[PDB]
Amino acid sequence: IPGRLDGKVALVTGSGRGIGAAVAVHLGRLGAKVVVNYANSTKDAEKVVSEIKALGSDAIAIKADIRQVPEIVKLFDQAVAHFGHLDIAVSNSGVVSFGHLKDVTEEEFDRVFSLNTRGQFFVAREAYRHLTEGGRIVLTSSNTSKDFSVPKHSLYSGSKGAVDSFVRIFSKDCGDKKITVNAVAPGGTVTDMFHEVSHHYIPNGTSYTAEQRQQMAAHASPLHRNGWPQDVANVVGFLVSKEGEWVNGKVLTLDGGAA
Amino acid sequence: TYIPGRLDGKVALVTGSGRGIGAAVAVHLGRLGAKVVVNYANSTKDAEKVVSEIKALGSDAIAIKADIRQVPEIVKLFDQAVAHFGHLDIAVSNSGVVSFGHLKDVTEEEFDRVFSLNTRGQFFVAREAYRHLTEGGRIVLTSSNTSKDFSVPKHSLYSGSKGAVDSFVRIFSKDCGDKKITVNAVAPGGTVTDMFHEVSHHYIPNGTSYTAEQRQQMAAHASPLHRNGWPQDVANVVGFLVSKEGEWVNGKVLTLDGGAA
Numbered sequence: 001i002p003g004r005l006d007g008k009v010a011l012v013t014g015s016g017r018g019i020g021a022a023v024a025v026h027l028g029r030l031g032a033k034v035v036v037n038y039a040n041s042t043k044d045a046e047k048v049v050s051e052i053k054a055l056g057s058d059a060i061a062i063k064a065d066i067r068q069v070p071e072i073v074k075l076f077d078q079a080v081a082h083f084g085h086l087d088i089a090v091s092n093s094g095v096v097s098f099g100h101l102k103d104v105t106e107e108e109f110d111r112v113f114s115l116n117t118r119g120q121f122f123v124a125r126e127a128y129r130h131l132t133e134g135g136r137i138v139l140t141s142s143n144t145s146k147d148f149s150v151p152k153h154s155l156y157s158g159s160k161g162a163v164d165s166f167v168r169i170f171s172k173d174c175g176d177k178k179i180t181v182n183a184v185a186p187g188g189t190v191t192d193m194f195h196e197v198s199h200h201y202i203p204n205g206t207s208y209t210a211e212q213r214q215q216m217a218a219h220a221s222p223l224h225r226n227g228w229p230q231d232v233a234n235v236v237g238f239l240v241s242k243e244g245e246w247v248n249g250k251v252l253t254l255d256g257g258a259a
Numbered sequence: 260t261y262i263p264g265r266l267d268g269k270v271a272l273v274t275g276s277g278r279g280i281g282a283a284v285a286v287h288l289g290r291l292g293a294k295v296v297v298n299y300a301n302s303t304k305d306a307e308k309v310v311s312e313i314k315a316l317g318s319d320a321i322a323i324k325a326d327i328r329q330v331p332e333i334v335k336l337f338d339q340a341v342a343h344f345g346h347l348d349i350a351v352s353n354s355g356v357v358s359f360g361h362l363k364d365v366t367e368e369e370f371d372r373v374f375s376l377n378t379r380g381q382f383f384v385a386r387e388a389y390r391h392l393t394e395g396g397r398i399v400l401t402s403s404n405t406s407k408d409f410s411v412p413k414h415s416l417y418s419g420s421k422g423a424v425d426s427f428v429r430i431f432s433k434d435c436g437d438k439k440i441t442v443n444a445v446a447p448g449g450t451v452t453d454m455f456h457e458v459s460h461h462y463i464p465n466g467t468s469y470t471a472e473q474r475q476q477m478a479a480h481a482s483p484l485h486r487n488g489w490p491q492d493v494a495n496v497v498g499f500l501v502s503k504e505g506e507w508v509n510g511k512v513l514t515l516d517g518g519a520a
């Protein structure tokens with residue numbers, strides 16, 4: 001059956017909740033066995049595992065702090081130990097940040113880059129080392145990397161700009177194992193992260209309700225609806241299929257046509 | 260008769276301007292009439308030569324040692340710049356290191372060596388530049404054609420270190436606009452410096468089978484102008500960006516590769 005992943009094993013970082021959760025469940029729905037990685041959300045990671053088993057596949061939750069490279073190594077070792085091999089690695093874990101350039105601290109730079117950029121880099125490295133030939137790597141960027149310009153969002157935007165460049169060159173190196181490497185760059189996608197910071201993207205964002213701010217994000221797409229975790233999961237599912245092979249080294253912005 | 264793009268009365272700071280591209284930028288800003296703070300980390304004698312050259316052109320300059328990987332040293336650098344010359348108008352962030360390696364072999368240490376200078380360092384030079392600059396000032400960072408325009412195997416770490424800078428400058432321009440400071444980056448291709456000898460065998464197909472001279476010739480032929488990029492080429496563009504006449508270029512990354520892309 002075309003676009004399915006039966007017999008494959010996938011790993012998704014930060015798939016206890018948000019976009020990662022949808023990606024994990026969806027890969028399972030396509031027939032992959034799934035390693036659900038989390039850092040803090042233990043109960044949520046188990047719910048996702050349960051859901052993947054319930055729809056007729058298999059899954060395991062594995063804790064790893066993706067800021068710690070030695071834990072990235074162990075994560076992948078434990079993934080292969082449990083399922084025997086690994087075919088698909090989706091790097092999804094990330095954090096958002098806002099602040100005028102003038103007040104960004106060393107600590108905030110390091111908090112953001114350590115996960116969004118450095119972490120994703122080494123997830124890709126360990127994915128290359130552990131993956132079977134013909135495999136798939138997908139990293140997560142953002143529409144703010146290149147397509148969308150938000151005041152006080154320089155740190156985060158840059159953290160994802162590095163990822164865009166990474167994936168283009170990763171595809172050159174990873175080709176000697178016929179592994180494709182791409183990134184998805186979502187726009188505003190309704191998750192905990194969305195509600196945490198939606199007031200930063202709108203003038204006087206604080207004087208609107210959360211619902212209003214979400215509605216306004218909806219109208220930034222010419223389809224007049226919000227992006228949802230499933231929208232990103234749908235695309236990742238195609239990229240990691242056999243049929244996605246000729247998309248390689250690319251960043252796909254997923255904003256419903258906002259840009 | 261009209262003379263474009265001069266910087267008389269202005270004060271500029273250039274990171275890593277003891278040698279390479281930074282050296283040509285510093286001298287050129289001096290030639291345009293700016294007083295220049297010549298920052299270096301190791302190249303003391305070269306920094307003094309640049310200082311001397313700027314004084315010879317009829318301007319003034321001072322060399323200040325600072326390791327741009329250390330944010331507290333960036334802060335001191337800019338404090339000392341303003342203390343010496345009274346104000347600062349122009350900040351050019353140029354210091355960087357190159358790296359090569361297949362993804363599979365890149366270590367934590369190599370990631371940190373590259374990013375600490377190329378990305379983090381540049382970010383905080385920009386931060387300190389915004390805090391110290393006069394209104395109407397200029398910030399220019401340094402990216403690379405490998406960020407977006409040129410794809411080189413085993414160059415992922417470096418390419419990404421500069422991809423972050425491209426994104427930084429577009430958003431920096433939004434924040435820095437409350438002091439009417441423009442922020443841009445130059446993204447050179449292969450430019451003949453000490454760093455060129457690192458990159459040259461990777462930037463040509465089968466680069467390893469050629470001599471250094473041959474590689475330089477082959478890099479020349481990657482431009483439709485059939486010559487190499489030189490530090491002066493980048494200096495010429497930075498000079499325009501930091502002039503009054505460059506104001507409407509803001510938030511942009513300008514690839515400088517003689518039309519190779």
Ligand SMILES: NC(=O)c1ccc[n+]([C@@H]2O[C@H](COP(=O)([O-])OP(=O)(O)OC[C@H]3O[C@@H](n4cnc5c(N)ncnc54)[C@H](OP(=O)(O)O)[C@@H]3O)[C@@H](O)[C@H]2O)c1
Nearest residue numbers: 014018019038039040041066093094142188189191192193
């Ligand atoms: N939603 C948007 O509007 C939007 C827009 C552009 C890009 N993105 C990107 O999409 C990705 C996911 O975003 P989201 O909306 O799902 O965010 P979210 O709701 O905040 O979820 C964050 C995810 O990252 C994981 N995570 C956080 N710290 C971690 C660490 N140290 N190690 C491992 N995992 C960690 C979390 O797991 P734990 O709870 O277990 O720590 C969680 O699964 C991020 O890369 C984000 O940059 C989102």
Ligand SMILES: NC(=O)c1ccc[n+]([C@@H]2O[C@H](COP(=O)([O-])OP(=O)(O)OC[C@H]3O[C@@H](n4cnc5c(N)ncnc54)[C@H](OP(=O)(O)O)[C@@H]3O)[C@@H](O)[C@H]2O)c1
Nearest residue numbers: 275279280299300301302327353354355449450452453454
């Ligand atoms: N040459 C090229 O083909 C090329 C192409 C694309 C982009 N670039 C970029 O252009 C910029 C300048 O390159 P280049 O070709 O002039 O390289 P280069 O010839 O190797 O010179 C490097 C410069 O960076 C400075 N630097 C290194 N480490 C430093 C530190 N910790 N603190 C402060 N300064 C430091 C050096 O100063 P000290 O000697 O005092 O340490 C030196 O002035 C870099 O950002 C590079 O990434 C170059």
Ligand SMILES: O=c1c(-c2ccc(O)cc2)coc2cc(O)cc(O)c12
Nearest residue numbers: 187188193194197198201216217220
């Ligand atoms: O784009 C938005 C908006 C948004 C942008 C423009 C509008 O007119 C309204 C909302 C709100 O919250 C977010 C929250 C996010 O985490 C990411 C985003 O991209 C956005």
